[PDB]
Design a protein around this ligand. Structure first.
Ligand SMILES: [Cl-]
Ligand SMILES: [Cl-]
Ligand SMILES: [Kr]
Ligand SMILES: [Kr]
Length: 162
């Protein structure tokens, strides 16, 4: 297991525009297109991202392409974020993947708001961080995913994904 496989599991793969868990237009592997409720808007943004007139449909390769870009940007965002970077650097390999997953999902801003959990992760207080992070909207809205991520932070293993 790796970051790609882990996120391909939590996000799925869809070749046509779809609405995510929050009702926003997305495509591929969790590639958010827009928060606007206009499908035309979504289609515009998709053609812009792909570079061709997609007409709301892409290929698997194109989807994997977006995903590579998105993972990369997520890591890069972490590294540039003053509150995130030090946590990330203190972690082991598996746990870093759990942090990339949350950032991918909710944006660095959203993740940088889990102040308390981040601190506990930094101190290597696994159970405590896991209990604190579950007290969140994130966990109450996407509980199966949130649990897999939290178990990962908690144990440092891929058991939740096996
Ligand atoms: Cl809560
Ligand atoms: Cl879920
Ligand atoms: Kr966190
Ligand atoms: Kr956590």
């Amino acid at each position: 297991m790796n970051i790609f496989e882990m996120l391909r599991i939590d996000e799925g793969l869809r070749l046509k525009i779809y609405k995510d868990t929050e009702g926003y237009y997305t495509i591929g592997i969790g590639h958010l297109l827009t928060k606007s409720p206009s499908l035309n808007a979504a289609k515009s943004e998709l053609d812009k991202a792909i570079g061709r007139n997609c007409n709301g449909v892409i290929t698997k390769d194109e989807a994997e392409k977006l995903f590579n870009q998105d993972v990369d940007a997520a890591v890069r965002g972490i590294l540039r974020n003053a509150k995130l970077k030090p946590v990330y650097d203190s972690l082991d390999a598996v746990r870093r993947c759990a942090l990339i997953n949350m950032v991918f999902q909710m944006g660095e801003t959203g993740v940088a708001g889990f102040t308390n959990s981040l601190r506990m992760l930094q101190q290597k207080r696994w159970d405590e961080a896991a209990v604190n992070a579950a007290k969140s909207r994130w966990y109450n809205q996407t509980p199966n995913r949130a649990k897999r991520v939290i178990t990962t932070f908690r144990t440092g293993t891929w058991d939740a994904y096996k």
